[model samples]
Target: MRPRLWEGQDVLARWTDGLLYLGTIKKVDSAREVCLVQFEDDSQFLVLWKDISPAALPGE
Candidate 1:
């Protein structure tokens, strides 16, 4: 099951050396400019809203 399109969608972030990893939006705290994300392995991390770029879906 995929997330709803209007729910901020998922995006992948790149490592400093340019490797990429997948994560999904848990919620957006626009007031604080933070994004709560749930990674594929069921791990959670919070990122700055400005720190992300899109990678699209996994194409599965």
Candidate 2:
């Protein structure tokens, strides 16, 4: 699903290598379909909007 993303939001983003990462949205570029993410380890980078999902409850 194409999520509505914004800066400072937390997300679970999937990398191109197929691993899921937890990070904070540092910036959002809706026009470019990309965003800057700051991972748990404080590493930051840009990722496509399609690669991220809003955080969900464990069972819901």
Candidate 3:
């Protein structure tokens, strides 16, 4: 099954530098397989679902 994504949820996205970014999901385009995420200062960008994963837990 595909991973589930929801708006207003925190998520970890894999960037081009191979780093994970923590941001809040503002929108999702299921048909295009893209997501719009916003960071602390309201900076936003689009990422593929495959490049996104559940945020790591406190102890993880």
Candidate 4:
């Protein structure tokens, strides 16, 4: 299994706009397999566990 996530983890989260960007985890709901993510612009939203991944800035 992959590393478990926790609050304050840095990640790349996909927003509803279907674009990915830098974000931070504010809360992780283990039971629900979802977490609340705060984007760089300070927009906070709930996302699935799979909706996030390690931070790799877009483009090579």
Candidate 5:
């Protein structure tokens, strides 16, 4: 995922295997270091930024 300023309003999107992935704005708890991403494939991935990249900065 690219660095984006999530305002809990912008649409969440991703692309994989030539598929255009998309989702609506649900909720994002930056404080908790978690993102509630609802994929268009009817799947939800609990993205833990901390775990994925421990040293991940706001924009890098």
Candidate 6:
């Protein structure tokens, strides 16, 4: 796998508890393999790269 994430990047991530919780990358910690996300709802969440996506699939 590659280091596809970086600071100040916009990305969407999913949590198994729900469908999607997306936002921008506030920070990245490869050590923890987690990133801080600031969502449109004005909330913050912790997301791992495994659950991260570059872009969301278009509605069909």
CA lDDT of each prediction against the hidden true structure: 0.64, 0.87, 0.86, 0.81, 0.48, 0.78
Distance from true location, Cα of 9 in model 3, Å: 1.0
TM-scores, all models, native as reference: 0.63, 0.84, 0.84, 0.76, 0.40, 0.74
Clashes of each: 0, 0, 0, 0, 0, 0
Could you tell me the lDDT of residue 45 within candidate 4?
88
Kindly report which residue stretches of model 5 are placed more than 4 angstroms away from their true locations once superposed: 1-4, 7-21, 50-60
For candidate 2, lDDT tens digit of each residue in 1-60? Answer: 267777898899998789999999999988888899999999999898888887763577
Clashes of 2: 0
Colliding pairs, model 5:
none
lDDT of model 4, residue 56: 44
User: Ranking under TM-score, best-scoring first?
Assistant: 2, 3, 4, 6, 1, 5
What is candidate 4's lDDT per residue for 1-60, written digit by digit as tens? 254677898888776799888889999888888889998889998988887886744583
Candidate 3 lDDT:
0.86
Can you tell me which runs of candidate 6 are displaced by over 4 Å?
A: 1-3, 56-60
Off by over 4 Å in 2: 57-59
Clashing pairs in 1: none
Lowest summed lDDT across 10 adjacent residues in model 5 is found at 49-58
Q: What range of 10 consecutive residues in model 4 has the weakest lDDT sum?
A: 51-60
Candidate 4, position 27, lDDT = 93
Backbone clashes in candidate 4 total: 0
